[PDB]
Amino acid sequence: MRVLVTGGSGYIGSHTCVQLLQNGHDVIILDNLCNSKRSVLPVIERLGGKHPTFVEGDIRNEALMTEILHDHAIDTVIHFAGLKAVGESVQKPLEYYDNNVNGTLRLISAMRAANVKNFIFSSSATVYGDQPKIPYVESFPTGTPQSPYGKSKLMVEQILTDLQKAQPDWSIALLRYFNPVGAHPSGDMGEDPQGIPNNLMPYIAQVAVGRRDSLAIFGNDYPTEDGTGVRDYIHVMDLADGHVVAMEKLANKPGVHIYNLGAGVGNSVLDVVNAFSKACGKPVNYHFAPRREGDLPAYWADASKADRELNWRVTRTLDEMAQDTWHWQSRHPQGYPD
Amino acid sequence: MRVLVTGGSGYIGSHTCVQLLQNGHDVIILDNLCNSKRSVLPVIERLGGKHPTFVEGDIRNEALMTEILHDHAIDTVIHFAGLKAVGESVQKPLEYYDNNVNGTLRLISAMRAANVKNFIFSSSATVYGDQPKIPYVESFPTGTPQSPYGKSKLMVEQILTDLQKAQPDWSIALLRYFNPVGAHPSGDMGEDPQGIPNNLMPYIAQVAVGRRDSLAIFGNDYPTEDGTGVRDYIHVMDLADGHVVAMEKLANKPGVHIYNLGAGVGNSVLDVVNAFSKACGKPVNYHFAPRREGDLPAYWADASKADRELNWRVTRTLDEMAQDTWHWQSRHPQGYPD
Ligand SMILES: NC(=O)c1ccc[n+]([C@@H]2O[C@H](COP(=O)([O-])OP(=O)(O)OC[C@H]3O[C@@H](n4cnc5c(N)ncnc54)[C@H](O)[C@@H]3O)[C@@H](O)[C@H]2O)c1
Ligand SMILES: NC(=O)c1ccc[n+]([C@@H]2O[C@H](COP(=O)([O-])OP(=O)(O)OC[C@H]3O[C@@H](n4cnc5c(N)ncnc54)[C@H](O)[C@@H]3O)[C@@H](O)[C@H]2O)c1
Ligand SMILES: O=c1ccn([C@@H]2O[C@H](COP(=O)(O)OP(=O)(O)Oc3ccccc3)[C@@H](O)[C@H]2O)c(=O)[nH]1
Ligand SMILES: O=c1ccn([C@@H]2O[C@H](COP(=O)(O)OP(=O)(O)Oc3ccccc3)[C@@H](O)[C@H]2O)c(=O)[nH]1
Ligand code: NA
Numbered sequence A, B: 001m002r003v004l005v006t007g008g009s010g011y012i013g014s015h016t017c018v019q020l021l022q023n024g025h026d027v028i029i030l031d032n033l034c035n036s037k038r039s040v041l042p043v044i045e046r047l048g049g050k051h052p053t054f055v056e057g058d059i060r061n062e063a064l065m066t067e068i069l070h071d072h073a074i075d076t077v078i079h080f081a082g083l084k085a086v087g088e089s090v091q092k093p094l095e096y097y098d099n100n101v102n103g104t105l106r107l108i109s110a111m112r113a114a115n116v117k118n119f120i121f122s123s124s125a126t127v128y129g130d131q132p133k134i135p136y137v138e139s140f141p142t143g144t145p146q147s148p149y150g151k152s153k154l155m156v157e158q159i160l161t162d163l164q165k166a167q168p169d170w171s172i173a174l175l176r177y178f179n180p181v182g183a184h185p186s187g188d189m190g191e192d193p194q195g196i197p198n199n200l201m202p203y204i205a206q207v208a209v210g211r212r213d214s215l216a217i218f219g220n221d222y223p224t225e226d227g228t229g230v231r232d233y234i235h236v237m238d239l240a241d242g243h244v245v246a247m248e249k250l251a252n253k254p255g256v257h258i259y260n261l262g263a264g265v266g267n268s269v270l271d272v273v274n275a276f277s278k279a280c281g282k283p284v285n286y287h288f289a290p291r292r293e294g295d296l297p298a299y300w301a302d303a304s305k306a307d308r309e310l311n312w313r314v315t316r317t318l319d320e321m322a323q324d325t326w327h328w329q330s331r332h333p334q335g336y337p338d
Helices: A011-022 A038-048 A062-071 A086-091 A093-114 A148-166 A200-208 A236-250 A269-280 A304-310 A318-331 B011-022 B040-048 B062-071 B086-091 B093-114 B148-166 B200-208 B236-250 B269-280 B304-310 B318-331
Strands: A002-006 A026-031 A053-056 A076-079 A118-124 A171-177 A179-181 A215-218 A233-235 A255-261 A286-289 B002-006 B026-031 B053-056 B076-079 B118-124 B171-177 B179-181 B215-218 B233-235 B255-261 B286-289
Touching: A002 A011, A011 A026, A011 A038, A011 A236, A026 A038, A026 A062, A038 A053, A062 A093, A076 A093, A076 A236, A086 A093, A086 A148, A086 B148, A093 A118, A093 A148, A093 B093, A093 B148, A118 A148, A118 A236, A148 A171, A148 A255, A148 B086, A148 B093, A148 B148, A171 A236, A179 A200, A179 A236, A179 A318, A200 A215, A200 A269, A200 A318, A215 A269, A233 A236, A233 A318, A236 A255, A236 A304, A255 A304, A269 A318, B002 B011, B011 B026, B011 B040, B011 B236, B026 B040, B026 B062, B062 B093, B076 B093, B076 B236, B086 B093, B086 B148, B093 B118, B093 B148, B118 B148, B118 B236, B148 B171, B148 B255, B171 B236, B179 B236, B179 B318, B200 B215, B200 B269, B200 B318, B215 B269, B233 B236, B233 B318, B236 B255, B236 B304, B255 B304, B269 B318
Parallel strands: A002 A026, A002 A076, A026 A053, A076 A118, A118 A171, A171 A255, A179 A233, A215 A286, B002 B026, B002 B076, B026 B053, B076 B118, B118 B171, B171 B255, B179 B233, B215 B286
Antiparallel strands: none
16 A cells, blocks of 8 residues: 655664555655654665655645645655644644644645545544543543643544544544554664653653753652552554554544554553563662653553454563663664764 | 724624724724625714725634734634524534634734724523523523534634633623624614525514515414413614624723623513514414424523623613514615615
């Protein structure tokens, strides 16, 4: 298939492009590079084993989007592109709604113009809001996301849903991600955050290669076994695989297909830290800081639907997630080159 | 004040401009004329006693919005522009989200660029979703709107809300409308829907003016006192007034100011029918029809907040609404001229 991967030079996108290419698909990457670097391109190619076309551009450029869809004869669209920092979303809501809400709106509008009707969306567990029932099941009604980030994702879901009603020929996948972590086993591709890493894994990794003093653990008095936050961490390679499968399996299958993509188990921040210390042969530095605004105590995925339906499930352990992260971080302390 | 009134040539906005001009404000109307006619302009100026500045254009055009706010030195915006046909919204969700959600996004983004910080949004009682508690109070949690129309409204509410949090110097009024009806007492201004009218009042008036054979009342079964749908009807003139007060009072007062604008009392379809017949002098031809999809059985506003805080309440009566509508319909049976 002729797939257009927006946000393809980004963390999840690049890994996904690798698996796609490995599967023989024709990959066209569309990325504005606001959170990624061109230098990942040759890596995706080398590892993908096949050349993916690259187009520097914005999902908000409807005309450009239409042009690509047509010119490249696209069959399906995997939409990873967007803004994804929770904290920042609070500080700059408009940028979030623009990129996320309007950015997706523009792309699908272009898809309509180009007559493309297969779509895969980068969703999120935030859509569930403050859900007391855990783990999260796709059948649960969506809650109220706390941040603009979270809201923007739910908003997009709703829109895609309405669109699919109005255009019943469309196959739309709403893929709800949990906590993607880890890196290509090659140690040559991985997450490459700019500035102070917001996320857990990346934060630890920089601590360990010495980019940071100490891991600040947000809150220690949660209603959890160790008091720290609990999450469903998933290896980015597993996530990547789930996309190829979803794309291959759902194309041309009308409907809104919702799936939690997670391991279906919780791990605390400390367990994460222990794994890391274990992967890197030296204890990681952390101190306890206050709870982070909007952090939930604990949740994880019920991913049985995908298993049943896509025959997909995770295969990498937390350990590999950590080993693999350390491998990338150590080979490339400052990430990708300019 | 120097006021940008988007959708200013439309029904509500037109009436609002007249009132604003009557208070001596400087008004700039921005309207893409997708549901209005230029011919309304001169009436506005005539009835308002002052010339309004008009600009033909689209709220989605951010550069234009910016240029307008800037060159015009606008200090407050009243945002009526958008699409509002419920049924069509279901068939054409994207256009809805684009004009309403993105249209508003573009508009506020322009405001930030031009440093304008006063806004009034035309909200709707639809945000309440399916609320069994009647009448509706501003403190009630929002619900799940059933159409792309209602959803877009709610989405705009939350976006504006997040924006205010991030830019706490903004004064944002979310004015929730119920069922606007009536017309300028001059009978020279009033609603002028194109094609087959979606709303009750225009239909009745068209029946009454011989433009339609018989009014269909949707559902006789309703758990109401007459089995017909119950609603909060508000005279457009009271509504315009409410906008003027809100604009005047909320200017430069930081916060998200949410208010139901309504009469605070319910009236059935048949109630309204009877009001018109007595207004028009002939019994209004009608019949029963099955329920219209999405219709709620009965709802009305709790408007005490606005009475309390803004010292505003409705002064016009139901008969006045019908009488005035009739007077405009009778005077301008074909609406505004081409
Ligand atoms: N639990 C969650 O909420 C969950 C968790 C992690 C990631 N995700 C989502 O997965 C997707 C990809 O995540 P990631 O970790 O790879 O992030 P990332 O930042 O590494 O990937 C996003 C890519 O999108 C690009 N981009 C952003 N705005 C764009 C625009 N307007 N036009 C073009 N390209 C643009 C960035 O340059 C980057 O290369 C995002 O939608 C993110 O929200 C969801
Ligand atoms: N119960 C409800 O939810 C409720 C009820 C009535 C009105 N309202 C809202 O009040 C507002 C005014 O309603 P109205 O009855 O006067 O409708 P209207 O159609 O008469 O006015 C809207 C005006 O905006 C203009 N317009 C629409 N899209 C535009 C765009 N993208 N750019 C520029 N101009 C554009 C149209 O030409 C029209 O003149 C709307 O936002 C409507 O949704 C809400
Ligand atoms: O420096 C950090 C960052 C995170 N955490 C904790 O680790 C867990 C995971 O947090 P996260 O920020 O890495 O991810 P998330 O759980 O908020 O989920 C995401 C992931 C990507 C985008 C949006 C939400 C949480 O309990 C968090 O409080 C820390 O203790 N220290
Ligand atoms: O030809 C008509 C029009 C409406 N109705 C009924 O009249 C009432 C009012 O309906 P409406 O369409 O005039 O307004 P609404 O109550 O749905 O509210 C609106 C108004 C504008 C935007 C969105 C919702 C309802 O009980 C509706 O079923 C009829 O019986 N016949
Ligand atoms: Na802030």
